[PDB]
Amino acid sequence: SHMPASVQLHTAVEMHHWCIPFSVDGQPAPSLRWLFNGSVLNETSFIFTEFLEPAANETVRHGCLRLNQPTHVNNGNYTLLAANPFGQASASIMAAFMDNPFEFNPE
Amino acid sequence: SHMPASVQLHTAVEMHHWCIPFSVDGQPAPSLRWLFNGSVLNETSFIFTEFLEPAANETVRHGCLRLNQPTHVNNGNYTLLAANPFGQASASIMAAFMDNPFEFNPE
Q: What is the C-alpha separation between A67 and A80, in angstroms, rounded?
A: 15
Per-domain residue ranges for chain A?
Answer: 1-107
Residues 27-66 of A with CB under 8 A from B: 27, 30, 32, 50, 52, 59, 64
What single letter denotes the amino acid at residue A37? N
Q: What are phi and psi of A74, to 5 degrees?
A: -100, 5
Using what technique was this structure determined?
X-ray
What is the resolution of the experimental data for this entry, in Å? Answer: 2.0
Residues of B in contact with A25 (CB under 8 A): 3, 5-7
Cα(A21)–Cα(A67) distance, integer angstroms: 11
Class of domain B1-107: mainly beta
**Nearest residue to B106 via CA among A53, A61, A52:** A52
Q: Tell me the chain A residues in contact with residue B81 when contact means C-beta distances shorter than 8 Å.
A: 7
